[PDB]
Symmetry: C3
Subunit: 328 residues, 3 copies
């Protein structure tokens, strides 16, 4: 087991990930990220070649979604079913209608006796953490109000690593440059991915209108993670209020929603980007990326959404398997 | 592989052709495709009635998206997927606006088709099913939309008719099927679709309705065109009646429609439309002995509960056949390949 | 071959009889059927606790119809079907009127039973479950209705009790089980059902409640009838208290219920000091204030193990009804 040049003791890394809950991207260390990226890649090649994907039969999951996040739940359902496991769904409720005046702690204590594991999406931060205390079974956070959404960060990173596999090397001479564009204050997907990218030799352009810029505590985390690996310089983090400057010499453009224009991506705005630049967007989009860009080979936001299948399959496999691993 | 012992079906050849086909409209199904669907449906009927292994399509994952309540049809599709041995993730109890939370139909289907092998889609918007078909990298089966397209209802209607009157398939000038369509023929879109499919064959139509609620001109033109193309059109091909006793005379099939009170000016005008076209053992005495009664269901007042005991009634077998026809269609479309030995027998 | 500590079970014979049986009411389950359910539940308990293969009923497709929210009970049934290796399609987030949309219960179940092997049905209407049973060509398991029939709740309550007090099965005059039912005994239908089942055995009942909320007369009569039939009825068979101190004295089981104000009957470590060493605490759940969170630590509490046993009991019942094996060799046997 290799990613061209890093040997993965997938056995050793699984013994450690077995029955781990994944709430925040900080719950995933370097070795765990390598295992997730290696395994995701195998599910990518197995599904693209129409091979048997059933590496985790015999599990029964509960999926609890206490806000509409139909794309994210469908992605998790598809991953569970494609692995050959089974799922029981709780949807089209909110927190108050589901906890009909019963405690979160009682609910998860009981529900964890029925299933092998739980996919949980709830806009309350409090609730996911109470669920983790009370559950006898691993929980995968599918998203909460504090902007923790680890499978989104993991599929974002997997997507970037497919075009720029040198992000993993921590080589001083091989730096990745990313522009984050739009609502960086409220775009929590940016906060999570920034935290993960700063573990590596990465340089950040935060492109926003003053009012909606990256929060100070996220810039502190980036600075801390860059200093720890001796990749911090005065050039590590730049701030722009316009695309022309922001999109210059960046390998990745990561677009977000801007609710309430200067931050609209078009084929025109993409002319003075590198030949190799790739465009991510966690989706859904509104106006932020013009439909014309879909034809531009730099666009990968739809491949990005697709990779979420492979990354969620990988993570379920590595956590819930009771080991013959996926290969080729 | 034969049907009626007349027509040999190259199920391999026909599968290679149907593989990953979307089915939106009954015109997406040709003669050979219909024969393959009828043959395969029949095998699933005999396999399930004899409690044998039904698992002819195991390794597939479907998404079922129903953006209006159509619980019988959704359950029928779920059951077909699950009985074949495949798996399904469901979207129900949403409408168009709550599901497309201001995201484009194009974007939504582009993403969702990366997660699954196939999509079952029901949406009252016709626009939406067509956009879904353009954007989806995977086959779509229309489970029903606003323009009255509902091809699996047409297919199970036809399968049901062909079980009692297998000569509809022969296109023989001397072996004509006579069907009476009864009730709200303006709004009974199930009639429009089945008419279109029956007119491909040697068939004669009684449209039994009252004034306001007759079969639309565009459907009559389609029937006329399809009958002329197979040299089965005469002055007798299409008759119109405003009452049962004339309408039900010398017809092999009676197809009753839903009559929703929602469709009149008041509850008055609705109750005098029921009564006029309500089916009873009395109204059925001067029908042929071989007459069979279909109804797409639900039945409310259109057919009296006493008729359920009448051996002419098949509307419950009809609903049941939807399982076997949806299993057949999924098998033929979503098998990754076919071998001689792998088809239902 | 199949033994229940010391009772030999002809699981083949009992299955040939239970095959395609509907289970609406706890009285649809006789002595032999209860022994089979307890034996089979126990196997699923040991198989799942040891992460062994649980797939003793693959190849089945169920419909689960829940025409009121009862999310815990629906999840429990879904989990049981999926763990057995079968498949289920769901009808939820509907009520009676939105699902029937003025089509008959009889037509709906006639059609739906052509699609599936079996139906799990929860509906507040009692009329509806009975019409569903007439119309369905396939077995129905009642998951709950308004007349308080909920047989899998009675069965998992009983399974839980039998795990700590296996002598309830012996019908031995010298080995009597004493249970206190606490709270809203008028409206706590789970009490009515369990009482009916426990009274088939050598059992003594403390009904602890106020005045407005006492056990109804007709349930006391059923208990008296079932106790008299097995020569276990005395003037001491049924006692009535309005306070915990007296109610909880010398009882092997405390079964708590919801007391919804539309104070006095709250279980704490203090109220549990004058119970037997061996007493176990059940509660069908959910709880509100009836049991203080401190009691969860008290080894006498088993209400969470109780809810867990619902998985193993619902797996057992689905297996025993819907299995189409022949061989004695194919039954669970840990
Ligand atoms: N209805 C928005 C949407 C898009 C994609 C998916 Cl997978 C699900 C829902
Ligand atoms: N009523 C909230 C709840 C739902 C499911 C389960 Cl299993 C437990 C409690
Ligand atoms: Na499902």
């Amino acid at each position: 087991y290799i990613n061209s040049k890093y040997k993965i003791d997938l056995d050793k890394i699984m013994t450690k990930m077995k029955n781990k809950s994944v709430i925040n991207i900080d719950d995933v260390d370097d070795e765990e990220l390598l295992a997730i990226l290696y395994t995701s890649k195998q599910f990518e090649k197995i599904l693209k070649n129409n091979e048997d994907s059933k590496y985790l039969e015999n599990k029964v999951f509960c999926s609890v979604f206490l806000e509409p996040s139909t794309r994210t739940r469908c992605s998790f359902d598809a991953a569970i079913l494609k692995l050959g496991s089974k799922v029981l769904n709780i949807t089209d409720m909110n927190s108050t209608s589901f906890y009909k005046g019963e405690t979160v702690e009682d609910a998860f204590k009981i529900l964890s006796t029925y299933v092998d594991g739980i996919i949980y999406r709830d806009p309350s931060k409090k609730n996911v953490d109470i669920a983790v205390s009370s559950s006898s079974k691993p929980i995968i956070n599918a998203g909460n109000g504090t902007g923790e959404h680890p499978t989104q960060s993991l599929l974002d990173f997997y997507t970037i690593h497919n075009y720029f596999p040198f992000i993993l090397d921590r080589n001083i001479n091989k730096k990745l440059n990313i522009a984050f564009v739009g609502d960086l204050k409220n775009g929590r997907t940016v906060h999570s991915l920034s935290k993960l990218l700063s573990r590596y030799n990465v340089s950040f352009n935060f492109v926003s209108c003053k009012s909606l810029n990256i929060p100070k505590d996220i810039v502190n985390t980036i600075t801390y993670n860059l200093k720890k690996n001796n990749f911090y310089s005065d050039d590590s983090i730049k701030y722009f209020d316009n695309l022309e400057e922001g999109l210059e010499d960046v390998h990745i453009i990561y677009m977000t929603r801007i609710q309430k224009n200067a931050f609209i991506l078009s084929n025109k705005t993409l002319e003075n980007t590198r030949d190799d630049t790739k465009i991510l967007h966690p989706l859904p989009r509104v106006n932020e990326i013009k439909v014309e860009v879909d034809s531009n080979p730099k666009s990968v936001y739809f491949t990005q959404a697709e990779n979420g299948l492979y990354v969620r399959m990988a993570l379920l496999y590595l956590i819930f398997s009771s080991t013959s691993h996926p290969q080729f």
